[PDB]
Amino acid sequence: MKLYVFLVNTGTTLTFDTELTVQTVADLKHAIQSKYKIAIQHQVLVVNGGECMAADRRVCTYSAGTDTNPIFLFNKEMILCDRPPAIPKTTFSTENDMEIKVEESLMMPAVFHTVASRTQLALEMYEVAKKLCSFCEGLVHDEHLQHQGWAAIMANLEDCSNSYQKLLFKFESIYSNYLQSIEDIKLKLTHLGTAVSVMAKIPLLECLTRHSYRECLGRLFFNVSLLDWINVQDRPNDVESLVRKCFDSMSRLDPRIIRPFIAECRQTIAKLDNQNMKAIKGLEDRLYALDQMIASCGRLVNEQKELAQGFLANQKRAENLKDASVLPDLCLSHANQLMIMLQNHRKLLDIKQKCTTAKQELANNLHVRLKWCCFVMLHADQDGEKLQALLRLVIELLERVKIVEALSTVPQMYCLAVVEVVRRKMFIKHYREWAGALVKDGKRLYEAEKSKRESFGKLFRKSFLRNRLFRGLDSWPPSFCTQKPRKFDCELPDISLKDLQFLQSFCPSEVQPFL
Amino acid sequence: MKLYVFLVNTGTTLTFDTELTVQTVADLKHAIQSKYKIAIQHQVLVVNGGECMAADRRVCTYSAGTDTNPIFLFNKEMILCDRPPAIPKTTFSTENDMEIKVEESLMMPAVFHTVASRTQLALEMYEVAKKLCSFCEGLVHDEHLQHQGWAAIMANLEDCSNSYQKLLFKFESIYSNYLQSIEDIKLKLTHLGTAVSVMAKIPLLECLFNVSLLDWINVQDRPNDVESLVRKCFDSMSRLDPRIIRPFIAECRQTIAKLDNQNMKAIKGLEDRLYALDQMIASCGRLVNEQKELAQGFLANQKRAENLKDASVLPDLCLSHANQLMIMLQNHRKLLDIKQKCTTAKQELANNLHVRLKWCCFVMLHADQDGEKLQALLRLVIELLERVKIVEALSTVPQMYCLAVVEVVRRKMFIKHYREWAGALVKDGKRLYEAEKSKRESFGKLFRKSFLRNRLFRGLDSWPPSFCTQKPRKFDCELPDISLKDLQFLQSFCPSEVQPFLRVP
Amino acid sequence: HTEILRGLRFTLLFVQHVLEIAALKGSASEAAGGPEYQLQESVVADQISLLSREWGFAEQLVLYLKVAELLSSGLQSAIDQIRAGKLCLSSTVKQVVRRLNELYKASVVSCQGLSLRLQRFFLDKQRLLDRIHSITAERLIFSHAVQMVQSAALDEMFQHREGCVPRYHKALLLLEGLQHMLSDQADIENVTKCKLCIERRLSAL
Amino acid sequence: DLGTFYREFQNPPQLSMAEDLDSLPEKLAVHEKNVREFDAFVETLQGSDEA
């Protein structure tokens, strides 16, 4: 067996050693350059099954390429060539000899010597008769491989089409979300702009020094506002930049521009789904007729080679006999038979020309169909690139929406946080006074009771009644509320009551920071 | 290595298989009785250093058994008998037959066969003298072993005497302490009588009905009640009064004084006995050396006689033989005198050790009975000095009863106050903590730990310690339910003597 | 045939000793004597006993109840063996059975009287009597025998070697009957150890 | 061996009252019955016999 590749558009099989299994797909195109020669850029290769051979894979992967299943190749440059590509015609020189010598032998009288010369002529011509439709069997391969490669590239195109359909479906789903999210983001962007306006006149307290703890003295006037901090965190983005980019993306994603593009995408889907070009009108019955004619090869051979062998044997015997009563009639009968077999041989020539003509017209229709296929491929590539870019933009919008939502509340959360932190700073004061008082009293109680109990036990330890008549005298108080509770809220910054004052009087957050 | 044991009383070597070594003292006694027919119960066994055999320790643990340091077996049978034992000898008629032949050989004329008889006689005589020397040395080394036996029993005696003297001194000191406390003990007993009279009246509360505290004290550790304790103390005081103990300790000190009789522990004439018997051993060795020399000279003279066939030589050579024979007879009688002196010295040492051991056994038995008596008296005194501690405890019982009642009622009152105090504290603590936690949880829900949780307003995730949120653990759970009513009842009924311990908050 | 008379006679002797123990437990607390007798004892110990006598009365009652049970069982055995012809009807059986009957009558009367004069004491102290685990006649008899032997040994050591023999004999005869009363094998082994030690001493004498 | 005799006797090892006293009256009734029966029998112990 051997590795094989087949060129479909020109209908040309390619023979390769099975040994080449050790080399990649790029190496296989370069092997087509090594034995044959066509520039790699022209080479488009697909397998029965439709997979477009990835350059890095080795042929061992793909389960085809044999004598009985080469891989399909296409010179898309030749396809893009305006011309209908011509036949890589083979030079069948033997036909010239056959015609010339056939006429030569026919001209001379059909005497037994001339009939023997015609017998030799038959030995040559009607034996190469087998070669003729052996070559036509090569073409028979060519034809059914053409159908198979046609189907393979159509599996490839259909795969591209389902990828296109899924991509557009996801696009229209995310845009169905955007259907309401566009007005929602308009509202939320009004909200963010409102928030930006709000951040003016709500100063970032001098408690910045404490919020950035490491700097307080560690870095060893301007009323810095919440602006120039919100955007300072996330330095490169101005937040105003966030609004600007949201508006820009909204404009590009507007249905005004988007819906016509999706209409073009739908038309691209329709063209990808063009069953008319995807099919060939009656190629199956065409190949069925070709099957009938290749069968006619064998049938007619069963006519000729029979007659030829019989004539050869009979002429040998009769000429060796030199019988004048048998040679004339038998030889002339064989001459008329040779005339009819010459008609049959020429019929071989017409069927050869007919099958080559079939090759040519299928190749021309296939040239047009590959032009359509390449146009669809290019349109699909463009549309896929654009769809991916716009999907990236849509997801950018659908993430910046959450970023805007987060950054919108920041004045509300600043107010809530400042009020809560002052509340805790005062509640800890109250709780500390409270715990101090309670612990003082509890320690007093505990020490007094412990002193009394020990001063008694010291007397009662040396007694006969201890633990025999009187029980439980060795117990102690539960030591409850005796020691100061551990710390809490020590990590809260030193925001003053005067800081809430610093805010509220001349920095309107709209009342909310009021306690 | 091989095991040997000794009967010091007579001085007979006892030899055993090594199988007894893996065995122990009791097995040693049984083996002694079985193989040598000495009763087990009569066996007193001692090692160098003065240790007496406990029946438990394996014999080798006591480092003895070799021929130079065996176990010493002292027989009670032989000390119960008044007379000293008899000692055997190595008996042979060969000595007397040899003497008779030497006397006869002196009167046998000068002929070759006579000289042959002479040389045979002398060759045998050398061996006889050698065997006499060996037997004598066996006896004398056996004596030198009887001496380590006596010294071992002396060591045991000294250890026993020191222990007995220490015990007597200890009892004398403890008895002096008791003697200076007889009046105090009697006063404490009178006080216990008073305290029992008091306890008879103090009601016993339901710490578990005309039950008094005395009845409760009585039902404890019966039938050893307080009356039994007092009478036992009085019995011991009766048994320990100095009119008995002082004479008894006088008799004891007399016992130690007789234990100090160095005239019996030390063998007088020991040094002389060694100085004489070892010198006699040296003399017998020299005598046997001369005997061997002259026997070989006899052989040489026989060699000369058999070859010098001249009739004038044999008579003179036989005169020389007669002079030599007289020399050999003198040497033989000297060796036999050495034998007699050694045997009589062994018998004399046996008798002297017999008398000294009779004295030692008597002294040791007297000291042991005195030790038993003193141990009993020490136990009496210590038990009495503990019973007086019990007596003092019982004397102070009635006061401690009232004080414990007062303490229990006060503790009930304090618990009543403490539960209220803790209830108020926990009420307030739970109120405040729940309010604060509700507010903080509300703020956490509003903040959603999302927006500025740590970026700007750092560390809002902190809570109060839940201090004073749960009530204190239980305490004073086992105290008897001594109501204030019970204390009032005791103040109503208890005698005046223990009222001051009740009339207080 | 007459060995059963040995059993009855031993029962008689043992109860005649337990009755002596009971009498000693009575009002007259057994005091010491001689010039060494501290005159303070007859004051202090006598006072305490006069204060706590009723517990001694209860001990006397349990001892009398135990001797009543012993005599009842012994006489029931004698009754059965006389009725069945297993025991000789006359001769020495007469005197032993009649003496057992006399002692039984005395014991029944004594325990009835002590119950009558302790009825009030029991009704008063019942609340305390629950906590105390009942003191049994076996404990009392064993303790009395042990203390008798200890006292006799002390007296013998301190030159009184003559009057000790009867005390040892009485202690031995008490323990001989005490073993038959105990059921726990540990207690029986203890009693046997003490009895065999007393036997060793008596043989030494 | 008086010494070891005492030494082991220095302290030989030792060997709800309401229940026994509650059972007491029945016990004494039983005892009275028993004494009556024993007296009634021993009154009849006048025979002659030997074994």
Short mmCIF file of all heavy atoms in Angstrom, two decimals, chain A residues 202-248:
data_model
loop_
_atom_site.label_atom_id
_atom_site.label_comp_id
_atom_site.label_asym_id
_atom_site.label_seq_id
_atom_site.Cartn_x
_atom_site.Cartn_y
_atom_site.Cartn_z
N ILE A 202 -18.63 66.76 48.77
CA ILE A 202 -18.68 65.73 49.81
C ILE A 202 -17.25 65.31 50.12
O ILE A 202 -16.82 64.21 49.74
CB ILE A 202 -19.55 64.54 49.36
CG1 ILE A 202 -19.52 63.42 50.41
CG2 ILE A 202 -19.14 64.04 48.00
CD1 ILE A 202 -20.62 62.41 50.23
N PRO A 203 -16.49 66.14 50.82
CA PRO A 203 -15.04 65.96 50.84
C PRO A 203 -14.62 64.62 51.43
O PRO A 203 -15.25 64.10 52.35
CB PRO A 203 -14.55 67.12 51.72
CG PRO A 203 -15.70 67.42 52.59
CD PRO A 203 -16.91 67.20 51.75
N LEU A 204 -13.55 64.08 50.88
CA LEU A 204 -12.85 62.95 51.49
C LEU A 204 -12.17 63.48 52.74
O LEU A 204 -11.18 64.21 52.65
CB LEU A 204 -11.85 62.35 50.51
CG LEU A 204 -10.89 61.30 51.07
CD1 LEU A 204 -11.64 60.23 51.82
CD2 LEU A 204 -10.07 60.69 49.95
N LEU A 205 -12.70 63.10 53.90
CA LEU A 205 -12.28 63.71 55.16
C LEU A 205 -10.77 63.67 55.32
O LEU A 205 -10.07 62.85 54.71
CB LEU A 205 -12.93 62.99 56.34
CG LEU A 205 -14.45 63.11 56.40
CD1 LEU A 205 -15.06 61.93 57.12
CD2 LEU A 205 -14.84 64.41 57.09
N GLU A 206 -10.25 64.57 56.16
CA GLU A 206 -8.83 64.55 56.51
C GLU A 206 -8.47 63.20 57.12
O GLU A 206 -7.29 62.89 57.30
CB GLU A 206 -8.50 65.68 57.48
CG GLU A 206 -7.01 65.84 57.75
CD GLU A 206 -6.67 67.13 58.48
OE1 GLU A 206 -7.24 67.36 59.56
OE2 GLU A 206 -5.85 67.91 57.96
N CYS A 207 -9.49 62.40 57.43
CA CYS A 207 -9.29 61.02 57.84
C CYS A 207 -8.67 60.18 56.73
O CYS A 207 -8.47 58.98 56.91
CB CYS A 207 -10.62 60.41 58.28
SG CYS A 207 -10.45 58.95 59.33
N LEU A 208 -8.41 60.78 55.57
CA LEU A 208 -7.58 60.12 54.57
C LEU A 208 -6.27 59.66 55.18
O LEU A 208 -5.77 58.58 54.86
CB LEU A 208 -7.30 61.07 53.40
CG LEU A 208 -5.98 60.90 52.63
CD1 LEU A 208 -5.98 59.59 51.84
CD2 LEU A 208 -5.73 62.09 51.71
N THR A 209 -5.68 60.49 56.04
CA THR A 209 -4.42 60.13 56.68
C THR A 209 -4.53 58.80 57.39
O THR A 209 -3.57 58.01 57.41
CB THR A 209 -4.02 61.24 57.65
OG1 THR A 209 -4.00 62.50 56.96
CG2 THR A 209 -2.65 60.98 58.24
N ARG A 210 -5.69 58.52 57.98
CA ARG A 210 -5.91 57.29 58.73
C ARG A 210 -6.37 56.15 57.83
O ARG A 210 -6.02 54.99 58.08
CB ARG A 210 -6.94 57.54 59.83
CG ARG A 210 -6.77 58.91 60.48
CD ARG A 210 -7.58 59.06 61.75
NE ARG A 210 -7.24 60.31 62.43
CZ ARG A 210 -7.69 61.50 62.07
NH1 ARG A 210 -8.53 61.65 61.06
NH2 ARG A 210 -7.29 62.58 62.75
N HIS A 211 -7.16 56.45 56.80
CA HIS A 211 -7.54 55.43 55.84
C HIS A 211 -6.32 54.86 55.15
O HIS A 211 -6.21 53.64 54.95
CB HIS A 211 -8.52 56.01 54.81
CG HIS A 211 -9.76 56.59 55.42
ND1 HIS A 211 -10.55 55.89 56.30
CD2 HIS A 211 -10.35 57.80 55.25
CE1 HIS A 211 -11.57 56.65 56.66
NE2 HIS A 211 -11.48 57.81 56.04
N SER A 212 -5.37 55.72 54.77
CA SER A 212 -4.05 55.29 54.33
C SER A 212 -3.15 55.28 55.56
O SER A 212 -2.37 56.20 55.83
CB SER A 212 -3.52 56.21 53.24
OG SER A 212 -2.46 55.59 52.52
N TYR A 213 -3.26 54.19 56.33
CA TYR A 213 -2.60 54.12 57.62
C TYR A 213 -1.09 54.22 57.48
O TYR A 213 -0.43 54.91 58.27
CB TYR A 213 -2.98 52.82 58.33
CG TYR A 213 -2.16 51.64 57.88
CD1 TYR A 213 -1.17 51.11 58.70
CD2 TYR A 213 -2.34 51.07 56.63
CE1 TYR A 213 -0.41 50.03 58.30
CE2 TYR A 213 -1.58 49.99 56.22
CZ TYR A 213 -0.62 49.48 57.06
OH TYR A 213 0.15 48.41 56.65
N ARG A 214 -0.52 53.55 56.48
CA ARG A 214 0.93 53.44 56.39
C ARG A 214 1.60 54.80 56.22
O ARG A 214 2.80 54.93 56.52
CB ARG A 214 1.31 52.53 55.21
CG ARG A 214 2.76 52.05 55.24
CD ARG A 214 3.20 51.54 53.88
NE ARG A 214 4.51 50.89 53.94
CZ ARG A 214 5.51 51.10 53.09
NH1 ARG A 214 5.39 51.94 52.07
NH2 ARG A 214 6.66 50.46 53.27
N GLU A 215 0.87 55.81 55.77
CA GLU A 215 1.46 57.11 55.47
C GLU A 215 1.39 58.09 56.63
O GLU A 215 2.17 59.05 56.64
CB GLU A 215 0.77 57.73 54.26
CG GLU A 215 0.65 56.81 53.06
CD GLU A 215 0.32 57.54 51.78
OE1 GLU A 215 0.26 58.79 51.81
OE2 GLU A 215 0.11 56.87 50.75
N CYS A 216 0.53 57.84 57.63
CA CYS A 216 0.08 58.87 58.56
C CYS A 216 1.21 59.81 58.97
O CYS A 216 1.16 61.02 58.70
CB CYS A 216 -0.54 58.21 59.80
SG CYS A 216 -1.15 59.37 61.04
N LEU A 217 2.24 59.27 59.61
CA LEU A 217 3.55 59.88 59.61
C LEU A 217 4.52 59.11 58.72
O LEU A 217 5.62 59.60 58.46
CB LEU A 217 4.12 59.97 61.03
CG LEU A 217 3.26 60.68 62.07
CD1 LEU A 217 3.94 60.66 63.43
CD2 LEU A 217 2.96 62.10 61.65
N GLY A 218 4.10 57.94 58.24
CA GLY A 218 4.97 57.03 57.52
C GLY A 218 5.55 57.59 56.24
O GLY A 218 6.68 57.25 55.90
N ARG A 219 4.81 58.44 55.53
CA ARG A 219 5.39 59.02 54.33
C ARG A 219 6.70 59.74 54.63
O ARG A 219 7.42 60.10 53.69
CB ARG A 219 4.41 59.97 53.66
CG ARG A 219 3.44 59.24 52.74
CD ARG A 219 4.01 59.08 51.33
NE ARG A 219 3.10 58.35 50.46
CZ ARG A 219 2.59 58.81 49.32
NH1 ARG A 219 2.89 60.02 48.86
NH2 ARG A 219 1.77 58.03 48.61
N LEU A 220 7.02 59.95 55.90
CA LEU A 220 8.38 60.25 56.31
C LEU A 220 9.23 58.99 56.17
O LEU A 220 9.02 58.01 56.89
CB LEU A 220 8.42 60.76 57.75
CG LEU A 220 9.79 60.93 58.42
CD1 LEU A 220 9.68 61.91 59.58
CD2 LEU A 220 10.35 59.60 58.91
N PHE A 221 -3.81 74.59 51.23
CA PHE A 221 -4.48 73.31 51.41
C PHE A 221 -5.53 73.10 50.33
O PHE A 221 -6.08 74.06 49.79
CB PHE A 221 -5.12 73.23 52.79
CG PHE A 221 -6.01 72.03 52.97
CD1 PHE A 221 -5.47 70.81 53.32
CD2 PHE A 221 -7.37 72.13 52.77
CE1 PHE A 221 -6.28 69.71 53.48
CE2 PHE A 221 -8.19 71.03 52.94
CZ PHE A 221 -7.64 69.82 53.29
N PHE A 222 -5.82 71.84 50.02
CA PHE A 222 -6.87 71.48 49.07
C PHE A 222 -7.84 70.52 49.73
O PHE A 222 -7.42 69.53 50.34
CB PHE A 222 -6.27 70.87 47.79
CG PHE A 222 -5.37 69.70 48.04
CD1 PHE A 222 -5.88 68.42 48.21
CD2 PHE A 222 -3.99 69.87 48.10
CE1 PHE A 222 -5.04 67.34 48.43
CE2 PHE A 222 -3.15 68.80 48.32
CZ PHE A 222 -3.67 67.53 48.49
N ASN A 223 -9.13 70.82 49.62
CA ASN A 223 -10.18 70.01 50.23
C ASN A 223 -10.43 68.80 49.33
O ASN A 223 -11.44 68.70 48.62
CB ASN A 223 -11.45 70.84 50.43
CG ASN A 223 -12.60 70.03 50.97
OD1 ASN A 223 -13.68 70.00 50.38
ND2 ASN A 223 -12.38 69.38 52.10
N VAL A 224 -9.49 67.86 49.37
CA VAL A 224 -9.56 66.69 48.52
C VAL A 224 -10.91 66.01 48.71
O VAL A 224 -11.31 65.68 49.83
CB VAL A 224 -8.40 65.74 48.82
CG1 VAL A 224 -8.44 65.26 50.27
CG2 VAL A 224 -8.41 64.55 47.85
N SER A 225 -11.63 65.80 47.61
CA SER A 225 -12.99 65.30 47.65
C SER A 225 -13.01 63.79 47.38
O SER A 225 -11.98 63.15 47.22
CB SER A 225 -13.86 66.06 46.65
OG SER A 225 -13.15 66.30 45.45
N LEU A 226 -14.22 63.23 47.33
CA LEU A 226 -14.35 61.81 46.99
C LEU A 226 -13.99 61.56 45.53
O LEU A 226 -13.46 60.50 45.20
CB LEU A 226 -15.77 61.33 47.29
CG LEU A 226 -15.98 59.81 47.37
CD1 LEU A 226 -14.96 59.15 48.28
CD2 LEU A 226 -17.38 59.51 47.85
N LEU A 227 -14.31 62.51 44.65
CA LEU A 227 -13.60 62.59 43.38
C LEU A 227 -12.12 62.69 43.67
O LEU A 227 -11.70 63.12 44.74
CB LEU A 227 -14.05 63.80 42.57
CG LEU A 227 -15.54 63.93 42.26
CD1 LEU A 227 -15.81 65.28 41.62
CD2 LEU A 227 -16.00 62.80 41.35
N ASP A 228 -11.30 62.28 42.70
CA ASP A 228 -9.86 62.25 42.87
C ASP A 228 -9.43 61.25 43.94
O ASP A 228 -8.25 61.20 44.30
CB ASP A 228 -9.30 63.64 43.19
CG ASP A 228 -9.93 64.73 42.35
OD1 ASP A 228 -10.34 64.44 41.21
OD2 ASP A 228 -10.02 65.88 42.83
N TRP A 229 -10.37 60.48 44.49
CA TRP A 229 -10.07 59.26 45.21
C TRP A 229 -10.72 58.06 44.55
O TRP A 229 -10.06 57.03 44.36
CB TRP A 229 -10.53 59.35 46.67
CG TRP A 229 -10.24 58.10 47.44
CD1 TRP A 229 -9.17 57.87 48.25
CD2 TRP A 229 -11.02 56.89 47.46
NE1 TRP A 229 -9.23 56.60 48.77
CE2 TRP A 229 -10.36 55.98 48.30
CE3 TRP A 229 -12.21 56.50 46.84
CZ2 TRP A 229 -10.85 54.70 48.54
CZ3 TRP A 229 -12.69 55.23 47.08
CH2 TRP A 229 -12.01 54.35 47.92
N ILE A 230 -12.00 58.18 44.20
CA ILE A 230 -12.69 57.07 43.54
C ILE A 230 -11.98 56.69 42.25
O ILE A 230 -11.74 55.51 41.98
CB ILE A 230 -14.17 57.42 43.31
CG1 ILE A 230 -14.92 56.23 42.71
CG2 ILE A 230 -14.30 58.64 42.41
CD1 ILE A 230 -14.60 54.90 43.34
N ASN A 231 -11.64 57.69 41.43
CA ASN A 231 -10.89 57.44 40.21
C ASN A 231 -9.40 57.25 40.47
O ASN A 231 -8.73 56.61 39.65
CB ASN A 231 -11.08 58.59 39.21
CG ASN A 231 -11.05 59.95 39.87
OD1 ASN A 231 -11.04 60.06 41.10
ND2 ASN A 231 -11.04 61.00 39.06
N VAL A 232 -8.87 57.76 41.58
CA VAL A 232 -7.47 57.52 41.90
C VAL A 232 -7.24 56.03 42.14
O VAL A 232 -6.33 55.43 41.56
CB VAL A 232 -7.04 58.37 43.11
CG1 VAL A 232 -5.91 57.70 43.87
CG2 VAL A 232 -6.62 59.75 42.63
N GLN A 233 -8.06 55.42 42.99
CA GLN A 233 -8.13 53.97 42.98
C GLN A 233 -8.64 53.53 41.62
O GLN A 233 -9.61 54.08 41.10
CB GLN A 233 -9.03 53.45 44.09
CG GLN A 233 -9.08 51.93 44.14
CD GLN A 233 -9.51 51.41 45.50
OE1 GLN A 233 -10.15 52.11 46.28
NE2 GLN A 233 -9.15 50.16 45.79
N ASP A 234 -7.98 52.53 41.03
CA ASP A 234 -8.13 52.24 39.61
C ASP A 234 -7.55 53.40 38.79
O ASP A 234 -8.21 53.97 37.91
CB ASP A 234 -9.60 51.98 39.24
CG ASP A 234 -9.76 51.26 37.92
OD1 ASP A 234 -8.73 50.97 37.27
OD2 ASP A 234 -10.91 50.99 37.53
N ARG A 235 -6.30 53.75 39.09
CA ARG A 235 -5.61 54.93 38.60
C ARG A 235 -5.88 55.23 37.13
O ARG A 235 -6.36 56.32 36.81
CB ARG A 235 -4.10 54.76 38.83
CG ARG A 235 -3.22 55.80 38.14
CD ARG A 235 -3.50 57.21 38.64
NE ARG A 235 -3.09 57.38 40.02
CZ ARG A 235 -3.04 58.55 40.65
NH1 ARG A 235 -3.37 59.68 40.05
NH2 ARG A 235 -2.65 58.59 41.92
N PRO A 236 -5.58 54.30 36.21
CA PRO A 236 -5.65 54.66 34.78
C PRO A 236 -7.04 55.07 34.31
O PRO A 236 -7.14 55.79 33.31
CB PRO A 236 -5.18 53.38 34.08
CG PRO A 236 -5.45 52.29 35.05
CD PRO A 236 -5.23 52.89 36.40
N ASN A 237 -8.10 54.65 34.99
CA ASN A 237 -9.46 54.95 34.58
C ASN A 237 -9.97 56.16 35.36
O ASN A 237 -9.84 56.22 36.59
CB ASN A 237 -10.37 53.75 34.81
CG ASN A 237 -9.98 52.56 33.96
OD1 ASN A 237 -10.13 52.58 32.74
ND2 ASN A 237 -9.46 51.52 34.60
N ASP A 238 -10.54 57.12 34.64
CA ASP A 238 -10.99 58.38 35.24
C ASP A 238 -12.41 58.31 35.78
O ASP A 238 -12.88 59.27 36.38
CB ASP A 238 -10.86 59.50 34.19
CG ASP A 238 -11.04 60.89 34.78
OD1 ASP A 238 -12.13 61.20 35.30
OD2 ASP A 238 -10.08 61.69 34.70
N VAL A 239 -13.10 57.18 35.59
CA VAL A 239 -14.50 57.04 35.99
C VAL A 239 -15.35 57.92 35.08
O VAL A 239 -16.29 57.43 34.44
CB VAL A 239 -14.72 57.38 37.47
CG1 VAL A 239 -16.20 57.34 37.80
CG2 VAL A 239 -13.96 56.41 38.35
N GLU A 240 -15.03 59.21 35.02
CA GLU A 240 -15.52 60.00 33.90
C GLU A 240 -15.17 59.30 32.59
O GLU A 240 -15.98 59.27 31.65
CB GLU A 240 -14.91 61.40 33.94
CG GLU A 240 -15.44 62.35 32.88
CD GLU A 240 -16.89 62.75 33.11
OE1 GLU A 240 -17.45 62.37 34.16
OE2 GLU A 240 -17.46 63.44 32.25
N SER A 241 -13.98 58.71 32.53
CA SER A 241 -13.62 57.85 31.41
C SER A 241 -14.55 56.65 31.31
O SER A 241 -14.86 56.20 30.21
CB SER A 241 -12.17 57.38 31.55
OG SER A 241 -12.01 56.54 32.68
N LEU A 242 -14.99 56.10 32.45
CA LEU A 242 -15.93 54.98 32.40
C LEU A 242 -17.23 55.40 31.75
O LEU A 242 -17.78 54.68 30.90
CB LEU A 242 -16.18 54.44 33.81
CG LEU A 242 -17.19 53.29 33.88
CD1 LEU A 242 -16.77 52.14 32.99
CD2 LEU A 242 -17.37 52.82 35.32
N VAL A 243 -17.75 56.57 32.12
CA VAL A 243 -18.98 57.06 31.49
C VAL A 243 -18.75 57.29 30.00
O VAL A 243 -19.59 56.95 29.16
CB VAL A 243 -19.46 58.34 32.19
CG1 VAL A 243 -20.62 58.97 31.42
CG2 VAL A 243 -19.87 58.04 33.61
N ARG A 244 -17.61 57.90 29.65
CA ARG A 244 -17.33 58.18 28.25
C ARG A 244 -17.27 56.89 27.44
O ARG A 244 -17.85 56.80 26.35
CB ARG A 244 -16.01 58.95 28.13
CG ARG A 244 -15.97 59.96 27.00
CD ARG A 244 -16.84 61.17 27.30
NE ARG A 244 -16.41 61.88 28.50
CZ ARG A 244 -15.49 62.84 28.53
NH1 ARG A 244 -14.86 63.22 27.43
NH2 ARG A 244 -15.20 63.42 29.69
N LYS A 245 -16.58 55.88 27.96
CA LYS A 245 -16.45 54.61 27.25
C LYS A 245 -17.79 53.89 27.17
O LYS A 245 -18.10 53.25 26.16
CB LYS A 245 -15.41 53.72 27.92
CG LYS A 245 -13.98 54.13 27.65
CD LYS A 245 -12.99 53.13 28.22
CE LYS A 245 -11.56 53.51 27.90
NZ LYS A 245 -10.59 52.48 28.37
N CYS A 246 -18.60 53.97 28.23
CA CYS A 246 -19.93 53.38 28.19
C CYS A 246 -20.76 54.02 27.09
O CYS A 246 -21.44 53.33 26.32
CB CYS A 246 -20.61 53.52 29.54
SG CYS A 246 -20.08 52.32 30.78
N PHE A 247 -20.71 55.35 26.99
CA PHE A 247 -21.44 56.03 25.93
C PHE A 247 -20.93 55.62 24.56
O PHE A 247 -21.72 55.36 23.64
CB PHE A 247 -21.34 57.54 26.11
CG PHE A 247 -22.29 58.10 27.14
CD1 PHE A 247 -21.85 59.04 28.06
CD2 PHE A 247 -23.61 57.69 27.19
CE1 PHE A 247 -22.72 59.56 29.00
CE2 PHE A 247 -24.48 58.20 28.13
CZ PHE A 247 -24.03 59.14 29.04
N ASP A 248 -19.61 55.57 24.39
CA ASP A 248 -19.04 55.20 23.10
C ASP A 248 -19.47 53.79 22.70
O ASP A 248 -19.90 53.57 21.56
CB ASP A 248 -17.51 55.30 23.16
CG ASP A 248 -16.84 54.44 22.11
OD1 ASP A 248 -16.80 54.86 20.93
OD2 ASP A 248 -16.34 53.35 22.46
#
